[PDB]
Amino acid sequence: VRKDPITKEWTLEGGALVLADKGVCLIDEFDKMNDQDRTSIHEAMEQQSISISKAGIVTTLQARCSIIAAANPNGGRYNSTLPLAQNVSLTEPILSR
Amino acid sequence: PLRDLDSEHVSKIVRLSGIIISTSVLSSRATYLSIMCRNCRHTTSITINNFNSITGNTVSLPRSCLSTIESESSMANKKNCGPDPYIIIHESSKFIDQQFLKLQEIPELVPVGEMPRNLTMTCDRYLTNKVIPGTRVTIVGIYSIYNSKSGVAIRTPYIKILGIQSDVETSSIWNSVTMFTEEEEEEFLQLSRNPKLYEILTNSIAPSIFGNEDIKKAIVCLLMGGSKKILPDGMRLRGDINVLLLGDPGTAKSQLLKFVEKVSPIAVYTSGKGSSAAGLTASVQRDPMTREFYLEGGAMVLADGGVVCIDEFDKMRDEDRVAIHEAMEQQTISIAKAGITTVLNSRTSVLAAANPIYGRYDDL
Amino acid sequence: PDAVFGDRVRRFQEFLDTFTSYRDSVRSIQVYNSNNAANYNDDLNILPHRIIISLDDLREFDRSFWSGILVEPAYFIPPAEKALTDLADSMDDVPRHPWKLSFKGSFGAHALSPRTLTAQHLNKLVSVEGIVTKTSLVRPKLIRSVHYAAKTGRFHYRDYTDATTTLTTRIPTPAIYPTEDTEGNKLTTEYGYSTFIDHQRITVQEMPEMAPAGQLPRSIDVILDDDLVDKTKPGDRVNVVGVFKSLGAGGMNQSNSTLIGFKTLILGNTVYPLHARSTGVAARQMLTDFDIRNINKLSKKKDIFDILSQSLAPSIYGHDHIKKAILLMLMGGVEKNLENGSHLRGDINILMVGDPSTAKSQLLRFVLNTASLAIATTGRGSSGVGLTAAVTTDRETGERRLEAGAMVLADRGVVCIDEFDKMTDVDRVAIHEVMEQQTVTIAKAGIHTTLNARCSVIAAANPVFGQYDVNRDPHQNIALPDSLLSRFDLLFVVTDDINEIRDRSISEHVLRTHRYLPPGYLEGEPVRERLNLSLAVGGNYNGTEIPKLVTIPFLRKYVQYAKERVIPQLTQEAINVIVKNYTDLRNDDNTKKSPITARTLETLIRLATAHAKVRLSKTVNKVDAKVAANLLRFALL
Amino acid sequence: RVTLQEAPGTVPPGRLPRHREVILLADLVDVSKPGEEVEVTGIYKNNYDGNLNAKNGFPVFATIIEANSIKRRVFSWTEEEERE
Amino acid sequence: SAALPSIQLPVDYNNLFNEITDFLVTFKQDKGPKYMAMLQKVANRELNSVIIDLDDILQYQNEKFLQGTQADDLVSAIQQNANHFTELFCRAIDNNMPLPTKEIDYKDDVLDVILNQRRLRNERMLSDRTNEIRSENLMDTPPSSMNDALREVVEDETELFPPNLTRRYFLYFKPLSQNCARRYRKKAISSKPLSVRQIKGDFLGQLITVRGIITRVSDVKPAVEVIAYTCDQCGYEVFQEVNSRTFTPLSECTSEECSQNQTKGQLFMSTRASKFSAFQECKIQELSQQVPVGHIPRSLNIHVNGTLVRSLSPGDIVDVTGIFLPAPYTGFKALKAGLLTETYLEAQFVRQHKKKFASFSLTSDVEERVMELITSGDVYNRLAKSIAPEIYGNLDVKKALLLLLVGGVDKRVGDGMKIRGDINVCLMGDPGVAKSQLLKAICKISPRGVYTTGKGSSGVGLTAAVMKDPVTDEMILEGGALVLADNGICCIDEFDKMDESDRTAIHEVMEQQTISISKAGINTTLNARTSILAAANPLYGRYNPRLSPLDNINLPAALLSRFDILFLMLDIPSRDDDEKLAEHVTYVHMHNKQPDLDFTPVEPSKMREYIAYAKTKRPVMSEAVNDYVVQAYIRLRQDSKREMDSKFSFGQATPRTLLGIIRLSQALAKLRLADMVDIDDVEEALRLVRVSKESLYQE
Amino acid sequence: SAALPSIQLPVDYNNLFNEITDFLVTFKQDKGPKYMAMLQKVANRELNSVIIDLDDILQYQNEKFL
């Protein structure tokens, strides 16, 4: 929920996951997220919804979006001897989804 | 739809849907007001039944004294009372409540490069305080017009609310209902006389989950809670049951959490680090308008008197860990910031799920 | 002259004549004021001219006048205030400001919250409970200006009124500030002969525990007048009784032309600070004579120290020495202020560390409920600015001001810190100054301030391995720095060693504790939770007013009495004992949980003084010193 | 009101893209999604503002395009497309 | 009319003015009358301010009562309505002003020659008017009655410069003392120091005294009281008074000539002919003992005008006596209810709880106390042992703390290079050795002592911040804790807990006595001449003999060298030494005072004035003490080189050690009030340095 | 409000109207009551004016007092 610095009027934006409801969310550079984004896509792939409690707004937005993501292995090169969990910074529950 | 509103809908009843993002404070408008002339002391009353107008005094105090034009008395004792001579007598005037709401189009269907569009709405009397921000509503109202002091003759649209319909009703302690009808009261008594009520309740818990009968029994026990004790020395004994589910991935513990979230009258499903924009435990931030401290939200507080389902319980922040510990045991959350100190209720049962290290659980 | 006004005045005369308590209260105020005036004449304080009125008594006497007071206070409160002024003037003729009215009792539908305040309650007397968030600067308001004309050598005056002064509206006659007399001579203002009445505006927001968890809060402005000024600080829980008023014209005039609406506020008649859990308002209880006699007859007994201690938390098995330490901390010792400004501590700090599920958090929650000014904090939840202070900016002046942290808010009080081990080092070194120097020094950008932080601290910590180990070094077990260890007066290691008889006894005690029913409650009915808001003035279940072990409401009457009344003084017979025990502890060969410094000596003095406070003794005795000395030995061995 | 800028391909290299305000009337509202390239035919006219511009020190007028027509430079299937 | 009705007040301004006039000519305290001799100095341009003491008026009333004549209570009337009595006293003074014995020369002030020209102009207009009226002879007709009517008509016709435009003095009311009020059974609410809590609306217009700490002081600015305009058309000077924060300038002339004429001249304002007051706005804050339980300290605005400017500095704990006056309302218009007013204190008198060392002067009354302290003998030990007498022992620590208070000789070289005279002391030891008590004792003793915490005082709380001052409407640099302790002592508790940025700030402070800030806000160097007293713990928290004293002291060598004295303070348990501490502490807790009755502690004010007189001294060193110091430094360097490989090392001796020895010797010479440094002072400095670290660690 | 203050007067128009009503039905001067027979003539369009004599009211008050 953000306030426009000129209009002084608040807007609720669901983000890319909510906006792609009944659609497709295309995430480039999947390995380079911060913690807040990782929690957001974790919640979206877990229960297909996004819960927000900010600025007096307590609600749940539908996030039934298919996700196509692109990522790079650690070190810039994939290693065949190591398995998939070691090749990415992605933790196992987000790889399972 | 909000963006399909047109000039053809002006001054007509429109039915429209959206999400409410802000509700203002209640203003006081005059319905009946008794006015008295300043020097003339002529007494008049004004009755207002129309509160539809915004940024306008469609009914106001008269610009000159009404005693002369009436000529009510035979004596009629050039005397001019002056412009705006009337004074409102407040102790004999009557008032109602007016509320400003803001309706936004739902964020699921918004163009990608566009800011979502919103409308200012007005409600009065019994239509006020019937909806909180975040609620998805259908609204019947008059698409109306005001001028705000970008085009020589441009008016900002607004809605005079005639009816509010809440599509779904959020669950909390304040919105909880305690009243029960006689037929459901008797029907629930026929449930308790069944000797196999335990078995049918356990089978009703997650029917599409195979196995885990002991976990389903523990979920039945968790949903009921226990008897809470308040002692003469003041030491409070909790009755809510907290259950942890540790295990390998793909074993339907997250589905059990989701089912408990669905079946519980009050329930919040979050991760260990919280939600995308809803935190865990309790968040005390400042009011966006008045800069005063208020409780923004949090999983353990919004589900007071209910169940908090914490998935991925192992991964958690440090402040959330101590808040979760206190809120499990004492069923309260202590908040001590530089502005506000309080102890607030978090009387909720915790159902947590987690995975062990190195992937699967190791017997060694 | 209005006839119905006079009839209402006569009816309130009849009510005041019937109930003689208000007649005695007016006279008691008058004798206090006249005695102070006579003391100022021969060789101080003055009481305001207002009377607390019970609404229930008025309802029993006259239901019509009571409903008039509640529903139309503008037509009923001024006649009653006129009646009270007539009574006080009739009695004060033998030995000038008109008398005011305050209201107490049940309000029914008028007991509201800032969210529940609506426009149907306008022009009605309402009682509103909430939290004070903002308070304005106290500003004088000119009521009568006095001027001097030097040419004629005469004094003139002009009276000023505004709409907030009167409940009934009046024709607004704005009389300008006179600089001429009627003949054109220059007037000079006579400051000091003019009268200025103090004026304040506060904001009362609904309480964060009575507010919905996700919504933005609702608030209301309250205007306070001369004697109601500065009865609140921000953060207080309050109950304000006053008239919900509408003011001015809500844009209906031509000059105004906007939808702020009619501006609404409460003209406060009464402000009650309320004691809530973990707030800055201290709990106080009105002591009757019978309670004082009960406290004094318990004071003469020999087992009073082992009676109050076991009656703190009887629902907790064991921890008998910890209950004694909590009682002595609640007594709190005597603070010394020397002639050169040097300060000496009086209050006692207790650290508890040990195994989980040992009722440490339950003891913290008990001290939060039973102490007058206890504030509960957590380890990582609170921060450095959370406990000490912070700097913000107010809207009007634009200059920086201070927001008081938990330690400053708990001045002359109790801080209960849970999860003491998980705290950040910045907040630790903040706490080093608080626990010994008893002050908080803020040196920020532009501001340099010293705040009082005279606090008792209870801390609950855990060992770094999660469980205490006997074979390991206790310094390795606690792993807390030496300087923090020295600050705490008593450190208690609570291990969950298990024995068959002890586990049997604790199991029986907890099982018989879970089989309790409150009086007046059915067997199957659930106990309801009502949040305790107490007015601040100025294992056996059946404990009923000191049979064997005292009740918690009586025990904090005893603690309050011992704190206000007795200030015990150290004597030689206690001094010899504490000196000998301090020397023995300094030169002991044994290993101790707590290190031994000169702080242990002052700990012995504080504990002896606190035990003397239990006995209501003005002198500290040898028996006080020996029990203070062997209480310390348990916390060390 | 629609903000229209010069398409970045047509802009000369060192120069910045110019922009105009285009006023769309009753039938022309919401035909152009932001981020799409269109051709607008309309009357090029001046905005009238009180006391002109005090910052410049010159009697300088702002300009707009009152759009007579909008032409653009959809997952709807017909009955024949379903058969195909 | 009935619009402004009259009221009868007990005050009468006729016999009060006559009482004021008779008081100023007949008050002979016990050359001639006091205020008549003071007005002679005022007329001779040697005195700028007139201080009216209410003690003098009370004594005058006592003498009038003993004579038997009836006198009005002038003290009480001044106390209730001081704003009127300022103008009454100014009128009385202007009525009886002695002629100046001195003549005006070219070295006088511009204001003095302006006022002299105005007085000469007034005399010339009076003489010209009476001369032309005599030239009329409009009756051709009792000489003395004719002259009386003549002066009556002449003083009524002409326009003169009023006495407000011919006054060269400022008038202030000194409050009556409590001690003098006790003698006559007078109850002085004016004397009683109030907190900011207790200054309510009923104190408005009264002369009251407030005690508190000064937090903010604005810069001195010219506030115009009356504006002077010149008219080219008529030649008049038009003056308009100003009593608000804003004014509207006059455009058309309003003199007597241009009022009647059809063509009005245009007024041009002149700064030199207009009247200004030196104006300062200050904030006073409640002391910590004044603040009630659980409350935040409040602040009061003080208006300082005239001669009293620059007498208030931030951090000073003061008694400010002034007139409590209302001001026009500042704030939101919607929030105001009726005739709301702001408040301020128009300052009249300032008393310092701690007297500044630079303000010390050798008055007569100071000299006998200094001679008494000297003739008592053993001054060094007496002053050292009386610093924190509730703390048992630590005699050498208190000796170095006294040398910290006094300091050494600040050195200026003709090349411009500077060697600091301030001494820096570190007190590092085990917990519970009362080092925080010693810092608090020193840092209340010193007049400009600022107590800080390791993490409670941040970097911006130490150095500076670029803040806007709204009353003067300018962005100014506002100092931190080190600026507040300038030419004082900065009192840093928990020294090892500080972050590295504050360590760099004090690193620049400790030697160069400056702070160089080059940020986005500011590019300055500012003076931070603090002597630094630091308190610290070892690295493990408890000292252990297994580690080297360099190892368990987490202090870099460069920051170690800055400290002139570092005291290791070991808490070593013993049966005999702990018992003396125990009896000392128990006696202090029981009788609320010090055990040993064989010596009387010096009072902090007496200690402050003796230290001030010591700081006035400027000792120098001779050849023999220089040779002894050189030999001692050589021995110290060789000894440190020997100890370097061993565990006994306390660092490496540096030239800073030599300069610290010289500084301590000069401080010890200052305590003896000698202009030279002796052998014994150098030996005492050397033994202090040796027992600071080596002696206690050896034991 | 204070613009039209109330005053207390000895006259009460409730028991005076009830006294007037009882006077018109029970005053039998010495067919049936006087003003009741007069109102019959008024109702029969035979009489146009009603004359209230204060002597009758004085006699009525005397009989009520006796």
Ligand SMILES: Nc1ncnc2c1ncn2[C@@H]1O[C@H](COP(=O)(O)OP(=O)(O)OP(O)(O)=S)[C@@H](O)[C@H]1O
């Ligand atoms: N016994 C079961 N019966 C039915 N569906 C099951 C069962 N076990 C797993 N599933 C399905 O497997 C999918 C995985 O969901 P969950 O097992 O709930 O995730 P989870 O691995 O338990 O949670 P984690 O540990 O955070 S990845 C869901 O679609 C479940 O419906």
Ligand SMILES: Nc1ncnc2c1ncn2[C@@H]1O[C@H](COP(=O)(O)OP(=O)(O)OP(O)(O)=S)[C@@H](O)[C@H]1O
């Ligand atoms: N020699 C002493 N004489 C008198 N009181 C003492 C002495 N040593 C210690 N104390 C007391 O013991 C307590 C120690 O408090 P502090 O002044 O904080 O000591 P400390 O040296 O600062 O310890 P820290 O802060 O952990 S380094 C105080 O109450 C002192 O008054």
Ligand SMILES: Nc1ncnc2c1ncn2[C@@H]1O[C@H](COP(=O)(O)OP(=O)(O)O)[C@@H](O)[C@H]1O
């Ligand atoms: N000695 C005891 N007597 C009675 N109850 C106890 C005792 N020890 C633990 N409990 C119970 O066990 C529960 C665990 O909470 P608690 O022991 O306070 O946790 P912790 O000791 O980790 O703070 C509490 O509700 C408390 O009532």
Ligand SMILES: [Mg+2]
């Ligand atoms: Mg899962």
Ligand SMILES: [Mg+2]
């Ligand atoms: Mg615990």
Ligand SMILES: [Mg+2]
């Ligand atoms: Mg200390």
Ligand SMILES: [Zn+2]
């Ligand atoms: Zn009129």
Ligand SMILES: [Zn+2]
């Ligand atoms: Zn002129």
